[PDB]
């Protein structure tokens, strides 16, 4: 004959949420034969970048700044060699950390405007972070939802044989909407 029967159902919980944290590092660099002048040009770059960031809606207290990293190459432009350069190169980093995640898009689209001033910015897309830092806080209720959805398909009637739960996934909604995240989990329940 047959020795047992069971039914398995996958329940789905899916939610779009708004990222609550944007981390946006803006690197900029200068070279100079004179180190004091290198620092003066980086400081003017810094002031100009901050003024641009505030025009874009960033507040002072969202902008962090570590000491610039200077490299002494021991070079001189007077030297007639194929690799002559300025003695010093320095790189600085204005690190934006803000809950105002919807600003990122306009900062990135407009930061090219600072070429005016001779500013050379580098923004690495790999290091721009849009995070939903409440991710772990929300998982319990979405697991419960997915498990309840599974139970209701199963009703739609013995005990449970095996229950399991995938890992959560978290994806950008759109290519052009990185501040909205789509969170998903699937709970698999098997009943007799």
Q: How many CA atoms, within 13 angstroms, populate the side-chain half-sphere of residue 56?
A: 25
**Residue 155 tokens, joined:** 């009703």
Residue 27: other Cβ atoms inside 10 A: 16
Dig out the tokens for 6 from the structure.
């069971």
Taking the CA atoms of 170, 176, 178 and 182 in sequence, report the sign of the dihedral they define: negative
CA distances for 63 relative to 23, 32, 57, 179, angstroms? 10, 26, 11, 19
Q: Which fold has domain 21-131?
A: Alpha-Beta Plaits (3.30.70)
Token pair of 115 as six digits: 């070429």
In whole angstroms, what is the distance from residue 90 CA to residue 71 CA? 6
Write the CB contacts of 21 (distance below 8 Å, at least 6 apart in sequence): 97, 98, 99, 101, 129, 130, 131, 132, 133
Entry field: residues in the chain: 192
Q: End-to-end CA distance of the chain, in Å?
A: 17
Residues with Cβ within 8 Å of 71's Cβ and at least 6 positions away in sequence, in order, are 88, 89, 90
For residue 93, which phi and psi values (nearest 5 degrees)?
-145, 115
Unique residue bearing structure tokens 């400081």: 43
Torsion from C-alpha of 21, 23, 24, 30, nearest 10 degrees: 150
Resolution in A: 1.9
Give the tokens for residue 44: 């003017």
Cα 180 off chain centre by: 12
What is the distance between the alpha carbons of residues 59 and 100, in angstroms, rounded to a whole number? 10
Tokens of 21: 């944290």
Q: Which residues contact 35 (CB under 8 A, 6 or more apart)?
A: 70, 72, 87, 88
Integer Cα distance of 26 and 114 in angstroms: 12
Q: SS3 string of the chain?
A: CCCCCCEEEEEEEEEEEECCEEEEEEEEEEEECCHHHHHHHHHHHHHHHHHHHHHCCCCHHHEEECCCEEEECCCCCCCCCCCCCCCEEEEEEEEEEECCHHHHHHHHHHHHHHHHHCCCEECCHHHCEEECCCHHHHHHHHHHHHHHHHHHHHHCCCCEEEEEECCCEEEEEECCEEEEEEEEEEEEEEEC
């Amino acid at each position: 004959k047959t020795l047992e029967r069971s039914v398995s159902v996958k329940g789905l919980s899916q939610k779009e949420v708004e990222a609550d944290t944007l981390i946006l590092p803006i690197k900029f660099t200068r070279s100079n034969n004179n180190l004091t002048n290198l620092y003066e040009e980086l400081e003017q770059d810094k002031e100009n970048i901050i003024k641009f960031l505030k025009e874009q809606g960033v507040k002072e207290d969202e902008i962090n700044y570590n000491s610039p990293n200077i490299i002494d190459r021991l070079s001189d432009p007077y030297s007639n060699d194929t690799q002559a350069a300025y003695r010093y190169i320095g790189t600085a980093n204005l690190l934006i950390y803000t809950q105002n995640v919807k600003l990122g898009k306009s900062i990135l689209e407009n930061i090219s405007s600072l070429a005016k001033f001779g500013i050379v910015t580098k923004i690495d897309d790999y290091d721009i972070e849009y995070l939903y830092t409440k991710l772990n806080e929300i998982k319990p209720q979405m697991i419960e939802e997915a498990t309840l959805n599974a139970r209701n398909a199963a009703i739609k009637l013995g005990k449970i044989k095996k229950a399991s739960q995938g890992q959560f996934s978290i994806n950008n909604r759109d290519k052009n909407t990185p501040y909205i995240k789509t969170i998903r989990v699937v709970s698999t329940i098997e009943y007799y």
